[PDB]
Design a protein around this ligand. Structure first.
Ligand SMILES: NC(=O)C1=CN([C@@H]2O[C@H](COP(=O)(O)OP(=O)(O)OC[C@H]3O[C@@H](n4cnc5c(N)ncnc54)[C@H](O)[C@@H]3O)[C@@H](O)[C@H]2O)C=CC1
Ligand SMILES: NC(=O)C1=CN([C@@H]2O[C@H](COP(=O)(O)OP(=O)(O)OC[C@H]3O[C@@H](n4cnc5c(N)ncnc54)[C@H](O)[C@@H]3O)[C@@H](O)[C@H]2O)C=CC1
Ligand code: NA
Ligand code: NA
Lengths: 415, 415
């Protein structure tokens, strides 16, 4: 109520908003619909430019399909191999005044671009750990695809409700046995922060294994096999990180490492199931460390990535999820000469474990306490890539323009 | 609900927003709290820099006190004369997600700055045309000030509900008798638009006089006098515009002109009342054309102002509300040698009626049809000053930062 109220239409701005990055620590509380879309398009265009991958899968299930590596796998299979893709993930839909999560807008863009190219895209939203979500997936496959011939397992989560019992598990990102003296980077005030990380409890370890270990992976493959929706000679892979010595205390030989090690045991039994069903296979694939919501939470990773980026960038070998995964498919999942390590894993992360890269990063580490961080590291690149995840800092996007946060996805089963 | 929901505080951004100009025609649907505040501070600092005005009023009522000339008068009297000021106006308070009008944030800033300097500031929000609002004002004066010694009348409104009957009147901004061939400026697409403005009806004229004529002014002075709240030897003034020939068909000799002419008749009777009460006085004051919500609606004014600005700017005589009003007070309301025209009005607008300024503007007028508008006019300056009204384009304000639109005003009577 003012002297001139109602004399004029309010317009669409009443339903739309200006979305700017709002970052705390390694969590960003907003996501930009238009920027997320441009992101997906960027990855699709990368794949389309590299060109088709021969001997690829045709009907693919991606578990964890909305962001990071799982998204890159979905895009590689669909736009690199022409595959049908059923995506599973867990994201918050946008509504008026309330932007959804990145994975939601990424996936909306996926369905949009896939339809444009005449590709099958359907998605299931909910708790991949649950029996309920497993059954919905099986149902979609039965109805639409008959069977899938590749299953990509790509979940990153802080917790898991056990499907059969009700117990919930929280993962811990902590060292093991010996407490670690942690260097690192306060990304807020942008200063070097020295910290002491206590090791983890036995239970803290058994939980982290429960969440990020390979039990659910095996549950998925088992579920698919007796509903009869896994094609003979199918292929499944689950993603992991090994890193080299500098990350070893916190990651490989830490709580999370313990879980990733469980992956290595479970894969043997899973591989057994598949070889019996028409000579399929199962592998753990190792990928390079990248900026993601998941990895950016790991103690040491922001500074490690900041240094890794600096060094790989000058060698000319820096890359992200889509490059990593396109080459995993081209060279390893579908190639004639696959890169197989001693434990029988597939490898895409070698450019990172390059001794020249690692030695450089290591002597830069202790040397860090700079508060002249911008000289020795690519902390700028890190920040830039972190914002990118949520659709910010993309060229060609007008961030000052109103955008509607209410974006819907067709063929999206809400579980 | 997402895999990481609720694990983190949302923070103040949930209650705050990013406010950007959203303009249609001559109406802007948003206002920036921080920018409006900076605006008020700018006008206060202007007055404080020019320095105190001698022989000023001490207790002042401003009717129409939140924006434009009325605001400039409130600031001049308070910060130029140390006066107590009671403001009356009609504005929309801000709330979460819904920015209030400019006048609201202007007035909040006024009360803030006035308290800082130990000055009396109280305000009344509602329909100045109503008997109800008149009575609340009288009440505040009785309680707080005893009497006021100056009354500034400064309303600009498209409509008026008659206090005694119930009739509502809409004003028309149209020519008279002979229809006008209107040149002009489409401010949206930024091109010269030629138009034909039909003249106005008799009733359209009588209504416009009802709204912008001087009946309410006289009602106010009369109301103040018999409640006994007008000091002996008081002074009242009402603002008007005359312009020169080029604006004459649309303004002076048009519908709005008719109303402003009514002012000239009513002032005689009002002056009579005041001279009897201890030798007070009443004048119509004439001010220069400025960008305001009110004036920016008048056909021809955006292009006229755009040209006026260009020309006055190069003569070095361009100025706005506070400059105009500070000098009205200094030279005319409080000075020894007041500028009085033939009809006995006070004059501040002479720099505008400068024959050199008018001749220049006139031959630039017909010459306009440029669609090279940026060369002949200061259309840029116009836009800039229009955005300024709503708190946009101010230096030192971070428009990318979240701001809380919920700003409250102490000692604000809501009528
Ligand atoms: N980010 C990195 O440096 C690297 C990560 N990895 C691995 O790759 C895999 C994917 O990780 P990122 O790409 O970083 O993660 P991310 O945070 O970008 O993606 C996780 C995905 O899983 C989905 N998801 C999470 N919880 C879910 C749930 N409860 N139910 C259904 N879906 C859920 C998310 O919605 C998202 O689609 C992980 O196994 C991670 O360990 C391996 C190499 C390095
Ligand atoms: N803007 C211009 O070029 C010039 C305007 N004038 C005059 O100066 C006076 C003020 O005009 P502006 O500064 O342009 O207007 P404005 O639009 O900036 O201000 C109008 C003021 O009156 C208040 N108001 C409007 N309707 C009200 C209502 N129903 N009840 C209580 N308050 C109400 C508004 O809230 C605001 O405080 C007017 O008489 C106008 O004719 C004179 C010279 C030129
Ligand atoms: Na993923
Ligand atoms: Na005013």
């Amino acid at each position: 109520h003012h002297h001139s109220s109602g004399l004029v239409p309010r317009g669409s701005h009443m339903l739309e908003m200006i979305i700017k990055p709002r970052v705390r620590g390694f969590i960003c509380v907003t996501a930009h619909p238009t920027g997320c879309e441009a992101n997906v398009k960027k990855q699709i265009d990368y794949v389309t430019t590299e060109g088709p991958i021969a001997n690829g899968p045709k009907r693919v299930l991606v578990i964890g399909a909305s962001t990071g590596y799982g998204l890159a796998a979905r895009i590689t299979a669909a736009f690199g191999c022409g595959a049908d893709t059923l995506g599973v993930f867990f994201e918050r839909p946008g509504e008026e005044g309330k932007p959804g999560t990145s994975g939601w807008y990424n996936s909306a863009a996926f369905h949009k671009f896939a339809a444009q190219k005449g590709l099958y895209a359907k998605s299931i939203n909910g708790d991949a750990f649950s029996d309920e979500i497993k059954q919905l997936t099986i149902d979609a496959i039965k109805q639409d695809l008959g069977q899938v011939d590749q299953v990509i397992y790509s979940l990153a989560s802080p917790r898991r409700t056990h499907p059969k019992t009700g117990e919930v598990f929280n993962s811990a990102l902590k060292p093991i046995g010996n407490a670690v003296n942690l260097r690192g980077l306060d990304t807020d005030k942008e200063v070097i922060k020295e910290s002491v990380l206590q090791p983890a409890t036995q239970s803290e370890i058994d939980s982290t294994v429960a969440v990020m270990g390979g039990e659910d992976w095996q549950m998925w493959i088992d579920a698919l096999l007796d509903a009869g929706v896994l094609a003979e000679g199918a292929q499944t892979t689950a993603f992991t990180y090994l890193g080299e010595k500098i990350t070893h205390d916190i990651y490989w030989n830490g709580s999370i490492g313990a879980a990733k090690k469980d992956l290595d045991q479970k894969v043997l039994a899973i591989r057994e199931s598949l070889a019996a069903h028409g000579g399929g296979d199962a592998r753990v694939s190792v990928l390079k460390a990248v900026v993601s919501q998941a990895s950016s939470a790991i103690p040491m990773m922001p500074l490690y990535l900041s240094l890794l980026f600096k060094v790989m960038k000058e060698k000319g070998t820096h890359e992200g999820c889509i490059e990593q995964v396109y080459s995993l498919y081209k060279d390893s999942l579908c190639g004639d000469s696959p890169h197989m390590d001693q434990e029988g894993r597939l490898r895409a992360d070698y450019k990172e474990l390059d001794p020249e890269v690692q030695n450089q990063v290591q002597q830069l580490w202790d040397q860090v306490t700079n508060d002249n961080i911008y000289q020795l590291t690519d902390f700028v690149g890190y920040k830039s890539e972190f914002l990118n995840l949520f659709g910010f800092g993309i060229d060609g996007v007008d961030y000052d323009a109103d955008v509607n946060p209410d974006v819907k996805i067709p063929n999206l089963i809400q579980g």
